Amino acid sequence: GSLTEDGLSYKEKFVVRSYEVGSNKTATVETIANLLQEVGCNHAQSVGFSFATTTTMRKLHLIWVTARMHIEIYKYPAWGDVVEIETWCQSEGRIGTRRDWILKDSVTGEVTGRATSKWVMMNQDTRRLQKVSDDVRDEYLVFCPQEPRLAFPEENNRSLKKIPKLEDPAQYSMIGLKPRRADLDMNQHVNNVTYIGWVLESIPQEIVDTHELQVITLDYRRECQQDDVVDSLTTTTSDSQFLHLLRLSGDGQEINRGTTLWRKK
């Protein structure tokens, strides 16, 4: 991949792999989310941020953490197809940062998906969320477009909707989910794509067989440790809409909450 001409965004092409597709021979939403993360990492490397912590952040032991992830897919690329992903970032004042993505069919040039994510600053050791400092914001502003550039521009759209907490009893559940070493990143933390898979595990197999996932919105509240056990809960709220909740098996401590939207094939 490479930065665009202005150096304010990054593009990369991916050929969809055999083990990356589901029963419809098209990429799963977890493959999509892995590709978004990969192009995001490559964008940070290309502009000198060898995740994307500034020099001031490293000094104060500060990192970027995902607070919200929102994905909308129109067409899932088929096995062997080339998908082009463009990514860019933007300052969100002082409450955090935003990373957006546009997915296109490399052959037709048509938009087949779009994603947005909200990131917040956190002390890596105490896990205490912070507001972004002035001297921190000026070292990454020069790498962002100055005028607003939104993957989800529409005034009051799905990407910024408030998500409620699922009430017991859940309609559906998948209990005792544990991460394995493949679910951990290079820093031994559970990678955020695993939570998408765990949320989707409580959706019944018949819904997966007859519908395609169009929208997924996820709020990240707490991280899951490598020795933690998770329960995945789903209730239909409706196209089919579902309310989701991931919580620790024992005490029931909330780790995630979300919503999915599915349309008949």
Added chain:
Amino acid sequence: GSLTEDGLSYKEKFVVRSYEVGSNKTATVETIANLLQEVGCNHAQSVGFSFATTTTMRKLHLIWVTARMHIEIYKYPAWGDVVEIETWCQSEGRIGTRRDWILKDSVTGEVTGRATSKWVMMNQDTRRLQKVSDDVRDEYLVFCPQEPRLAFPEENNRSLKKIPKLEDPAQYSMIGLKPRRADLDMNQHVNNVTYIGWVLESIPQEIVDTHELQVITLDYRRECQQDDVVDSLTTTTSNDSQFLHLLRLSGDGQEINRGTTLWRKK
């Protein structure tokens, strides 16, 4: 990727991804095994197949299944590195087929890994193994080198060693392992790379932190269903550390896999 000049082997280059690496910033053995499967699938597609089912196999409802997988890694590629993989197949008479791989550093040209796998023919519906018929063998022989070409040629080598069954009690164990939808392939069967991860789950974290996996040999006895639960068992058998492995169903203890791993100090 592409077939070589003679059309008897296939090469493909891969750039190692961020989520594909472990704590050392190098590709995991599961990333390697996924790449081997991907280049294998692309080789079958490039020569006219659609996995590697001949016309006679489709007529009789027959498929290729892995019986044994053997991987030896000298250097795991780092994140952002380009790895080149060459793959080819060879008929093993009526026993079945063999698929071999060579992994090279694209910049240095040096061999950094090699793998071999034994495949057997099975009826899709009854799951009954069978020998390769003459009609089937002639349909794929023209796509293989005629003279032997072995990734593991050595007259006394690890790839053909008999693996014993682990005896209870196991030294280490990881219980209650279940596959999720990400662990299933396009035909909704548990992907063979998941079994490698499940085998590795019973290795203690301190061994993983201080050693690197050099060799892994896996025998496939039975498939794990999407609603099945697995127990992973390990016992040390040994500088280098060797382990004996066993995957079995949580309930009745029905064997699904058995294997051995070899690790060297970093």
